[PDB]
Structures are given as structure tokens and as C-alpha cells.
Design a protein around this ligand. Sequence first.
Ligand SMILES: CCOC(=O)c1c(C)[nH]c(C(=O)N(CC)Cc2ccc3c(c2)OCO3)c1C
Length: 373
Amino acid sequence: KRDLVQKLKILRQELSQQQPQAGHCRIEVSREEIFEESYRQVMKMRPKDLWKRLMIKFRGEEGLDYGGVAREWLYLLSHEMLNPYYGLFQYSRDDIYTLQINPDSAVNPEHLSYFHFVGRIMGMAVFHGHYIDGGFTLPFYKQLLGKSITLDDMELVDPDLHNSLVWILENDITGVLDHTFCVEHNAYGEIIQHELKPNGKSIPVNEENKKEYVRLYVNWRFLRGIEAQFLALQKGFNEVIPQHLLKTFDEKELELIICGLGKIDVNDWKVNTRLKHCTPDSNIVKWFWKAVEFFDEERRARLLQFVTGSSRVPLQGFKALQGAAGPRLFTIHQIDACTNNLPKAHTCFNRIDIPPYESYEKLYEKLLTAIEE
Ligand SMILES: CCOC(=O)c1c(C)[nH]c(C(=O)N(CC)Cc2ccc3c(c2)OCO3)c1C
């Protein structure tokens, strides 16, 4: 933990130097067209403009203070640009929670400029210390942060290919594997023969060159069909965050930064929760924590996402939980409502509204029904 905290202090220090002393990054956009209007304004700016202090205004709105409006625009846009509606990203069919690049994004001919823009925004979130659980896989984040893709990463991407490549590396393939440095794949009904390296079609894979074959294969498979999109996103990102500044961080550290604590702890959660219209020793609070304690990691993540908008636990735990404006502890609010209603969430204030359920079993079932699907 200490090593990571120190690297993050060094990173923040180096990034503050990149920020010009004078000038501002001025953005004026409507909330209703946040994506498109931010796209137009950010893409007219040079990379050096993106490092300047943010001066943001929402169209037709006065705003309380610039710092707060900048925090709100960056949070809202970073989440909005991930919406499948804009044609850049989509949820995996196999893994319903995983966000990935849409391989058919080219239906919008300007798609590359849009991915460049998203990269700039992800860079700007890093620059202003925002930790966003976008939903991408860890190897997606590692590629963006300049880390090499490993054969280990292929396990979940393509399990059969992973076993085959591990087999190539670990065993003598001579006279069993009959392959060359050319891979074939079916893209949109046509078989593409792709050479991993020059003259690939005429180079057989053998004991001497199999390590290079597996490395090139892993790189190609990982970005297959999304090469241009990923390159535009990386280019936008590297215009805000220099690659050299991240070389110090290892894979494990990157995982903790983007996804937060590896487990949702019910003890840390309950001692950092605010109570409204219920007391510490009440039945409703006792039954709520008894349900959360029974909940497994999956159910606790569903509960945290339901109440806060994210299943990411900050590295400092629940005492560091944040809402819309800034710091907002998780809140249990006992409401005066019909006990057949499900619990209601207000993700802005990390708050859950609970009717006065008559028994633990009733609270348990209603909470489970509310966090389903
Ligand atoms: C190595 C040190 O890393 C950092 O300092 C650091 C900070 C401050 N934030 C981030 C981070 O959260 N992401 C990385 C791009 C994820 C992310 C951001 C914006 C997004 C998004 C996902 O989905 C859409 O908008 C990192 C890694």
C-alpha cells in the first residue's frame, strides 16, 4: 500500500508541473448535449490547452463555483461518453457487465476523432485525480496505460486459444503443430489472412521462433477488429498523460487504482454509514447489516451499485465514499412508506430509503428483489 501511495504522490507532483501557471481551459456546454458539445470544444483545443485550470459553465446556468462545476462536468461527461448510444462502446454479450469498444463503430465515419476525444477526456480525468470505474477489463486499462498484454490476460478473452498457446510454449510442438506466422479470422463474412510479421505466410512456427509467434499472436488477438479505435483512444490519452510518467506502476497497482479494494467489507461499510430517521440499535439497522453480512461479494457489489452508482470501493474504504458534490457517506434513511415497496436509491447522495419492514426476512427479500438484474 505504501509503495503505491508514494508513486501516486510523485505522479500528482509531476502532473502539477505540466499545468501552466496562466490561462484556463474554457468549456461551455448544455447538460442535454454534453457529449457532442464537449466533443466540438475539446477537439478544437491543442494538447497544452487541456492542462490548464478548468473554467466550465453549463449553458443557461449560473453555477455555484467553478471548481464544483468542473468536477460535475468531468464526472458527467466521463460516464456519458461510455453510453452505447454514441456508438463507441458497448456491453459484452457474454459478460453483461463488461464494457468494450464497439468493433462496428465505423458506421459513424468520424468515429476515430470521437475515440481521440474520449482518450483526451480519460486523460483529463487522470490529470484532475478522478477515479472512474468505467467497466473496461483490466487488460484494456493496461494497454491504455502502456503495459504489454500477457498470455495470462488471454485466459478470459479466449480460453481455448489461451490453452493452445500455453501448450505451444510449454511443450515440444515439432511435427504436431503445423502452423505459419499467418492467422486467419472471419471478419464480416470474409476470411482475412493476416501475417503477424513480414513474409509470415512462408515462415513455419518451430521451437526456435514459437515464443515470438505466441507474443505476436497475443497482441493481434487482443486488439482484433478494434485496432484503429484503440490507437485513437491511446493517442488522445497520451496528449494529456505522458506515457513515461506511468512506467513505474505495475499491473497489481493499476488494478487497485481503477477497480478499488478487492473485497467489499461489511465492517468498514457499517462503521462509515450515516443513519437518518433510524437509530444505531434499531431493528431496521440491525436487519440491514445482517442481510449485508449474509450477502456474498456479488450481492454486495449489486447493493453498492444500486445505492451509489458504482461497485468500486475507494482505496481508503467507505469513509472516502463520494457523492455528486464531493464527500458523501453511505446513508440509510428509514422512510414513512408502504412496507410492500422495495428500497429506493438516490445515487447522488449514496442514500437508501427503507420502509419500516416488520421482520428481518421481509427486509432481506425486498432488498434482494430491489438489487436483482
Ligand atoms: C497509474 C496512475 O493512475 C491514476 O493516477 C489514475 C487516475 C487518477 N484515474 C485513473 C482512472 O480512473 N482511469 C484510467 C484512465 C480509469 C478511467 C478514467 C476515466 C474514465 C474511465 C475510466 O471510463 C471513462 O472515463 C487512473 C488509472
